[PDB]
Amino acid sequence: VDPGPLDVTALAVAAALAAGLHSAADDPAAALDKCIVLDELTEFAEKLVVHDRPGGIGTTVEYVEVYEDASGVRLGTATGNAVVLKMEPHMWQFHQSVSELADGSFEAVGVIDCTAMLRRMTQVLRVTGRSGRYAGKSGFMTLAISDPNQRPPHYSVQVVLC
Amino acid sequence: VDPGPLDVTALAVAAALAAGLHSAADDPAAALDKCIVLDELTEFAEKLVVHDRPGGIGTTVEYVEVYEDASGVRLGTATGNAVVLKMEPHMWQFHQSVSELADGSFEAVGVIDCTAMLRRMTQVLRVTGRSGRYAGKSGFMTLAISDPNQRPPHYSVQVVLC
């Protein structure tokens, strides 16, 4: 049960590569300054609405999550749905959210393995800018459970868009 | 060291969701019939050109992979690159590939924890059609390693495209 995290630079390069810049793998440093980086965020459920389904598969969750920086001051919210695709022996979900910050907003899509996140694996979603500073940009977001014993769960988050 | 897996129906729903309808969330049979499904695929390298960089980070890989069915007959090839992002404690890579079958072609992009794949975890990429029947469709593909000790590795693969 070993964490395997991903740092911002690494995530920034992947965002830059997926974006189209092959300059990225060569020059790690050059990626970041061009890219939009959000580090040291925590995300947690402010409100969850579960629509269960027999045995879990199809179960839908509408959520509103809050982004806190390193002081515990809100930076934005994420709003969206999660659908349960599998239960056993790993729980899997589909996620789609729109995150609104001061600067603007972006969208997040992905397929998360919850079970793996609880064994401290980092998970990834695709990010796409929607408005403001983020418009036209695209990226990735990493999700990591700080401590699996704590409920409600809290997540460490990074987002890079290029 | 425990999986992990994600079945094809569950995958088709994720594909259908991201693609479009929320009908997919509930009624899965609908997704499956509407969408394109490649199952029972085995993938391995026909050739690998590694361009190392000191310490691993930025090690670029160029590859031609081959898709076999359950009869060990080729269905297509995947031609791509991989860029190492992090080595420790987990190895991560960015992958981007064009895959060519008879029917058409599609692209695949994502960020794989290689290490977790050796704990027999399923990894997921985002897929997009490019040619032929696949054109204009979208989805996901999964990867898992059959035997972590087996060398070179063989990956079990599914692709669903909606």
Side-chain angles (χ1 to χ4, degrees), chain A residues 1-21 23-25 28-162, chain B residues 1-21 23-25 28-162:
Chain A
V1 169
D2 304 312
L6 199 62
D7 72 90
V8 252
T9 321
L11 181 63
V13 169
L17 296 170
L21 333 186
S23 11
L32 307 133
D33 286 89
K34 288 38 174 61
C35 301
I36 301 182
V37 182
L38 291 181
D39 219 359
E40 249 192 350
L41 312 179
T42 346
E43 186 174 333
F44 50 61
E46 217 195 18
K47 139 119 144 157
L48 315 146
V49 168
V50 187
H51 293 72
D52 292 289
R53 177 78 99 272
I57 287 130
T59 281
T60 295
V61 196
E62 282 133 33
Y63 56 72
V64 174
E65 304 259 319
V66 143
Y67 293 126
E68 316 291 274
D69 61 27
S71 48
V73 160
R74 164 144 112 220
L75 281 290
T77 60
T79 305
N81 328 358
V83 183
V84 174
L85 308 158
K86 196 74 137 39
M87 212 75 200
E88 314 284 339
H90 280 192
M91 172 172 226
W92 284 85
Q93 311 145 348
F94 191 70
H95 272 229
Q96 38 136 116
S97 45
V98 173
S99 304
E100 294 148 70
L101 286 284
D103 324 277
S105 85
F106 67 79
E107 187 172 14
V109 187
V111 166
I112 302 179
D113 176 336
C114 302
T115 302
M117 200 141 58
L118 282 155
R119 317 241 197 266
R120 288 210 108 182
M121 224 105 305
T122 299
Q123 287 280 294
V124 181
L125 317 171
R126 201 228 177 170
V127 177
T128 7
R130 242 193 140 293
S131 76
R133 161 161 90 119
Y134 310 87
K137 308 270 188 275
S138 86
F140 301 95
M141 146 167 220
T142 59
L143 250 36
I145 276 169
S146 323
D147 173 70
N149 295 330
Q150 232 62 5
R151 166 100 63 66
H154 295 25
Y155 308 87
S156 311
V157 151
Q158 299 143 321
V159 191
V160 192
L161 311 90
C162 295
Chain B
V1 196
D2 122 283
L6 185 61
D7 60 83
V8 245
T9 98
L11 199 65
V13 178
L17 288 168
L21 76 187
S23 148
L32 271 122
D33 205 86
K34 301 162 166 197
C35 317
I36 315 184
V37 177
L38 306 166
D39 213 6
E40 284 205 291
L41 291 195
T42 311
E43 170 183 346
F44 47 66
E46 129 152 298
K47 70 176 273 206
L48 301 175
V49 183
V50 184
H51 294 261
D52 298 277
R53 319 249 308 257
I57 284 58
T59 285
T60 261
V61 191
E62 284 128 43
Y63 54 88
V64 182
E65 290 265 342
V66 133
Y67 295 120
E68 313 284 275
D69 58 31
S71 37
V73 170
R74 178 154 133 185
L75 303 326
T77 67
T79 304
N81 1 279
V83 175
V84 176
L85 293 171
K86 218 204 168 61
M87 289 290 292
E88 292 269 86
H90 282 189
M91 172 159 70
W92 285 84
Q93 301 172 211
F94 181 80
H95 285 246
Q96 189 144 35
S97 52
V98 181
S99 308
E100 284 141 287
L101 305 179
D103 314 273
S105 72
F106 64 71
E107 190 163 357
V109 186
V111 157
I112 310 191
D113 179 337
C114 298
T115 299
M117 208 144 54
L118 298 155
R119 321 286 158 155
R120 303 193 78 153
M121 223 106 85
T122 287
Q123 296 281 268
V124 187
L125 310 188
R126 181 193 109 224
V127 169
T128 308
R130 259 173 33 91
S131 239
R133 96 175 154 157
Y134 311 99
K137 313 211 177 257
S138 21
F140 304 88
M141 129 181 232
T142 61
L143 256 39
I145 296 165
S146 333
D147 170 34
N149 226 28
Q150 218 256 12
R151 277 254 43 172
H154 301 49
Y155 298 97
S156 326
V157 152
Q158 300 141 313
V159 193
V160 187
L161 261 151
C162 286

